Design a protein around this ligand. Structure first.
Ligand SMILES: CCCCCCCCCCCCCCCCCC(=O)OC[C@H](COP(=O)([O-])OCC[N+](C)(C)C)OC(=O)CCCCCCCCCCCCCCCCC
Ligand SMILES: CCCCCCCCCCCCCCCCCC(=O)OC[C@H](COP(=O)([O-])OCC[N+](C)(C)C)OC(=O)CCCCCCCCCCCCCCCCC
Ligand SMILES: CCCCCCCCCCCCCCCCCC(=O)OC[C@H](COP(=O)(O)OCCN)OC(=O)CCCCCCCCCCCCCCCCC
Ligand SMILES: CCCCCCCCCCCCCCCCCC(=O)OC[C@H](COP(=O)(O)OCCN)OC(=O)CCCCCCCCCCCCCCCCC
Ligand SMILES: CCCCCCCCCCCCCCCCCC(=O)OC[C@H](COP(=O)(O)OCCN)OC(=O)CCCCCCCCCCCCCCCCC
Ligand SMILES: CCCCCCCCCCC1=C(C)C(=O)C(OC)=C(OC)C1=O
Ligand code: SF4
Ligand code: SF4
Ligand code: SF4
Lengths: 156, 314, 110, 43, 51, 176
């Protein structure tokens, strides 16, 4: 009918707006933050996708966890995650944030950042290249594109 | 009929602000050996629309504000004072022809700091209040040199009327007899709108940390409108154009080009230098700019008397 | 007449934009957040430096209010008197600045 | 044997010193330019 | 090394440890921005500091 | 053997003094910085058009892991457990048993891609070139469990990327 068409077009509009202006915050913990800085370099140019460089935590959309999440750092990570306005997304970069990586069996390393925050995109590597993090960002954009919030609201 | 004039003044201001955001992103990118946004639209022409919609569907922060009244009132004042400082601007004919338009602009610019003060006080954070107090002190301290420079420049004009400022520069540009005032005025307007290398609130808490994304966008839009307005005012003051009374489009195109070049110079400045410290810019103002501004003010009072060149009162 | 119409238009456009910026995510039903400055509960420390620069700005603003009618006053016939009074006023401005300078008034916010 | 080796004559020159062009006019020349601009404007 | 194929002890001495220790003496009588400049002028990577 | 950075005394004659004072009053070095940033504006940017243009790589590149086969269909891994012994992160789990025709083959070969540090020790400890680190790097997943590869996933990766892995090995095997 008409209402389903209207909510489908509005959903496409809001998903295009959200996926094309992803403002990231980056947790500069370890090596993978240096590789994030290298993706923000002129060669790969995160800004040209609408993805700004080092936005504020109070206005960012996607939060990137690039490095090792230790036991002394995890409550601060949760506190930063809780203050982000919705819609919020989390990208895990590298093995240390994915599952612990080299320091998985350590006494002071959280075995994956998914034990603290919900994670949408997992980027594998040690460090994953700037190409790989760019691919993960674009895959997150694809995930945002196929969201169906207004259709779900109309059907309920 | 007059509301058509008001609307065609105020809607292109918002359009120019959004495309100023796009232009600044692209120019900084091309100045940092990279590209700006070129994926969202053809050469990023759709970036401000997407960014505006995203910021207007963002979750609000919902702070524990000490006063919801001034929490509402601060963006109201910021946007109203950003939009109301365009009506005596000659383009080449001002929308509201004012006999004292220059001093009206000075009054509005002096009144503009209440948004910073109320945004700092409304947020419960004490560090936000301290940042707001420092920003207010810097703003008023540069209001001082704005007033002295404008007073000393106006002695070649003869009145406070903004339309006579075109008539004064009918022969030569006003940057030729008052270039030190032009340099000090440009730096003072750069520090007036809180721009680099004077944007201390981005360097190590802002005055609007607890504000929601929408009101933050409104504050930022007011700041960019202030930037464009100040550059147009500087162009009118020092780089006056040739105005044919039968073809106003000549003056409109000429000062549009000059003011766009001055705003691009603002963006050029913001990506070349490190930021100042607070005491360093206070030293630059109270101990470098102010004595030379006073000396040049005395010089430009006593000069037209000794040259038999008093400008006409009317 | 036209001026206050323009003022009302600017005020109502600003308040319309602020109302839409506030109350539009209010129609969203996102979530309820608990949320349980670097200083926790410290009192604001009173600094004499910020008050001193504020009062110095106020006094210089007053002498600016005195200096303002110079473009109109330059059209007088008594040009020697007006020139002498203008130079005396700006000299008093300079002397007040120099007294603030020498007695360490502009210190740590120079 | 084949290996990654430098050539027989070696490589070309590679700079490692500071290089600042020292361009523009003198202090007297720029002061004279500014004073001349002021005089033209006043005239 | 105790003679086996695995090390008995491996201490890593990093310069960032000593520089961050001296940061208190560096930043005495300075401002907050001078503190961040002092932190910058010591090449501090916290992977070598915390280890 | 050493040099004195910043030990240049300033000249005190009137020429140098007026040059420094003119530089102070007219802001010469600020104009220098502005002009050079302007010169850097008019250069072609170094940005490549991802995903339509890819950054350069080498045949030694270490990306996604794969299990290879002999050029007869038979797999190359003979369950010697050297790769899991040399793995610095203990990301490899191997279980073996003799299969139906008596060959020494693995029954379980798991690699944890969230534990692995992508160091390439396994592909150089393999005596038969069975385990390799292929050239693929764009394999981000939306779930943690999709990064826990079993034997079937690694064999599928080998069958998928053989036409490139064999060429990279042919290009690089004389340096080993
Ligand atoms: C609108 C038109 C365009 C304007 C210019 C726009 C492009 C240029 C932008 C430049 C860079 C801007 C970003 C940085 C801004 C902050 C830095 C800054 O401006 O610092 C100002 C600096 C600060 O000085 P300072 O801090 O270096 O001074 C040293 C002071 N101590 C030693 C105490 C530390 O300079 C000034 O304030 C000078 C202002 C202009 C002076 C003009 C003098 C005119 C000539 C008078 C006569 C001279 C001859 C002698 C007498 C003869 C009598 C007959
Ligand atoms: C011009 C500048 C920009 C202006 C604003 C942007 C332009 C587009 C404005 C309409 C966008 C769609 C509605 C607002 C965004 C809703 C997003 C959202 O979260 O939706 C789920 C929400 C809630 O859906 P829900 O019921 O699934 O709730 C999910 C949340 N839980 C489960 C936790 C409760 O939808 C709405 O709130 C509907 C709002 C109105 C829908 C459109 C009506 C017609 C508009 C024309
Ligand atoms: C003062 C001047 C101010 C100017 C401001 C604006 C500047 C930029 C102007 C626009 C520049 C070009 C934008 C092009 C957008 C993309 C158009 C397009 O082709 O979209 C295709 C897309 C998918 O189409 P589909 O049917 O799925 O494709 C399958 C067929 N093979 O279909 C869709 O996405 C749906 C349809 C989208 C149509 C978008 C059209 C452009 C919208 C511009 C908005 C602003 C317009 C100007 C407003 C001010 C002046 C009046
Ligand atoms: C009753 C019926 C109407 C109901 C309400 C709906 C109103 C109209 C809303 C806009 C049109 C709906 C469709 C939105 C886009 C859907 C199609 C789509 O996704 O197109 C994708 C395409 C770019 O493809 P992309 O995936 O980005 O690929 C990157 C390159 N490899 O994208 C493009 O090519 C560009 C897409 C542009 C979308 C339109 C332009 C922006 C919106 C303008 C109107 C709203 C805002 C007006 C201004 C507000 C103030 C800023
Ligand atoms: C928290 C509260 C809300 C905050 C946001 C809204 C208020 C603040 C932002 C707007 C500020 C508006 C300032 C209005 C006065 C500015 C001075 C002025 O009117 O100058 C223009 C003109 C004098 O120039 P002249 O050329 O001599 O006059 C024509 C001579 N042939 O004078 C005229 O043309 C006179 C015209 C008739 C008189 C007009 C009176 C206007 C209404 C009273 C003031 C309204 C603002 C009150 C609130 C102030 C701030 C709290
Ligand atoms: C009537 C409403 C018009 C739209 C609102 C103003 C234009 C949108 C500004 C968004 C924005 C952009 C593009 C932006 O690039 C940016 O980074 C510097 C911001 O500040 C963090 C912004 O707020
Ligand atoms: S995954 Fe590897 S590169 Fe990234 S932080 Fe951990 S050890 Fe460093
Ligand atoms: S690349 Fe290194 S860490 Fe990864 S599986 Fe092979 S030996 Fe283990
Ligand atoms: S080193 Fe090679 S042959 Fe040995 S168990 Fe590992 S993959 Fe199989």
């Amino acid at each position: 009918s008409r209402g389903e068409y209207v909510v489908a077009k509005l959903d496409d509009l809001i998903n295009w707006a959200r996926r094309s202006s992803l403002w990231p915050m980056t947790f500069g913990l370890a090596c993978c933050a240096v590789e994030m800085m290298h993706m923000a370099a002129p060669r790969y140019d995160m800004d040209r996708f609408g993805v700004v460089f080092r936005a504020s935590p109070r206005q960012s959309d996607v939060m990137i966890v690039a490095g090792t999440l230790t036991n002394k750092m995890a409550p601060a990570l949760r506190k930063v995650y809780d203050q982000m306005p919705e819609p919020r997304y989390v990208v895990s970069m590298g093995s240390c944030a994915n599952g612990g990586g080299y320091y998985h069996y350590s006494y002071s390393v959280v075995r994956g950042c998914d034990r603290i925050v919900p994670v949408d995109i997992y980027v594998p590597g040690c460090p994953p290249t700037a190409e790989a993090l760019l691919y993960g960002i674009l895959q997150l954009q694809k995930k945002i594109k196929r969201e169906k919030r207004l259709r779900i609201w109309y059907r309920r | 009929m007059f509301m058509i004039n008001v609307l065609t003044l105020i809607i292109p201001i918002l359009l120019a602000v959004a495309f100023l955001t796009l232009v600044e992103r692209k120019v900084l990118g091309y100045m940092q050996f990279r590209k700006g946004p070129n994926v969202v639209g053809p050469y990023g022409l759709l970036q401000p629309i997407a960014d505006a919609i995203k910021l207007f569907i963002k979750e609000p922060l919902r702070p524990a504000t000490s006063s919801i009244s001034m929490f509402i009132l601060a963006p109201i004042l910021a946007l109203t004072l950003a939009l109301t400082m365009w009506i005596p601007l000659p383009m080449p004919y001002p929308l509201i022809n004012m006999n004292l338009g220059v001093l009206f602009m000075l009054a509005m610019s002096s009144l503009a700091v209440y948004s910073i003060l109320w945004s700092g006080w409304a947020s419960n954070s004490k560090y936000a209040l301290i940042g707001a107090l420092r920003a207010v002190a810097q703003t008023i301290s540069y209001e001082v040199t704005l007033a002295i420079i404008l007073l000393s420049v106006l002695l070649m004009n003869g009145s406070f009327t903004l339309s006579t400022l075109i008539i004064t520069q009918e022969q030569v540009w006003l940057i030729f007899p008052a270039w030190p005032l032009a340099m000090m005025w440009f730096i003072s307007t750069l520090a007036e709108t809180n721009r680099a290398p004077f944007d201390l609130t981005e360097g190590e808490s802002g005055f609007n940390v607890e504000y929601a994304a929408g009101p933050f966008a409104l504050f930022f839009m007011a700041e960019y409108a202030n930037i464009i307005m100040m550059n147009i005012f500087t162009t009118t003051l020092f780089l006056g154009a040739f105005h044919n009374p039968y073809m106003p489009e000549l003056y409109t195109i000429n000062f549009t080009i000059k003011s766009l070049l001055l705003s691009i110079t603002f963006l050029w400045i913001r990506a070349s230098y490190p930021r100042f410290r607070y005491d360093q810019l206070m030293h630059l103002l109270w101990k470098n700019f102010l004595p030379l501004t006073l000396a040049l003010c005395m010089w430009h009072v006593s000069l037209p008397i000794l040259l038999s060149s008093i400008p006409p009162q009317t | 007449m036209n001026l206050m119409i323009t003022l009302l238009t600017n005020f109502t456009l600003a308040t319309l934009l602020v109302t839409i910026a506030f109350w539009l995510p209010q129609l969203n039903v996102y979530s309820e957040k608990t949320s349980p400055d670097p200083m926790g509960s410290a009192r604001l420390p009173f600094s004499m430096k910020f008050f001193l620069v504020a009062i110095t700005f106020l006094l210089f603003d007053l002498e600016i209010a005195l200096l303002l009618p110079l473009p109109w006053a330059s059209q007088t016939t008594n040009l020697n008197t007006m020139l002498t009074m203008a130079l005396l006023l700006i000299f008093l401005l300079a002397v007040s600045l120099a007294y603030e300078w020498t007695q360490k008034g502009l210190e740590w916010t120079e | 044997v084949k290996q990654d080796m430098p050539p027989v004559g070696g490589y070309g020159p590679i700079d490692y010193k500071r290089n600042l062009p020292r361009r523009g006019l003198s202090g007297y020349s720029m002061f004279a330019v500014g004073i001349g601009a002021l005089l033209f404007g006043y005239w | 090394s105790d003679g086996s194929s695995r090390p008995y002890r491996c201490k890593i001495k990093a310069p960032g440890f000593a520089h961050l220790a001296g940061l208190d003496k560096m930043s005495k009588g300075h401002m907050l921005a001078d503190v961040v400049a002092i932190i910058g002028t010591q090449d501090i990577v916290f992977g070598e500091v915390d280890r | 053997t050493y040099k004195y950075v910043n030990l240049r005394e300033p000249s005190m004659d009137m020429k140098s003094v007026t040059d420094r004072a003119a530089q102070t009053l007219l802001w010469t070095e600020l104009i220098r910085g502005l002009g050079m940033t302007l010169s850097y504006l008019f250069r072609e940017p170094a940005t490549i058009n991802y995903p339509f243009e890819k950054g350069p790589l080498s045949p030694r590149f270490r990306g996604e892991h794969a299990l290879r086969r002999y050029p007869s269909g038979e797999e190359r891994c003979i369950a010697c457990k050297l790769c899991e012994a040399v793995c610095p992160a203990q990301a490899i789990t191997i279980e073996a048993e003799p299969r139906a025709d008596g060959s020494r083959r693995t029954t379980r070969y798991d690699i944890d891609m969230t534990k692995c540090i992508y160091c390439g020790f396994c592909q150089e400890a393999c005596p038969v070139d069975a385990i390799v680190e292929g050239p693929n790097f764009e394999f981000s997943t939306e779930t943690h469990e999709e990064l826990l590869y079993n034997k079937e996933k690694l064999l599928n990766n080998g069958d998928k990327w053989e036409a490139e892995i064999a060429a990279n090995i042919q290009a690089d095997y004389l340096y080993r």
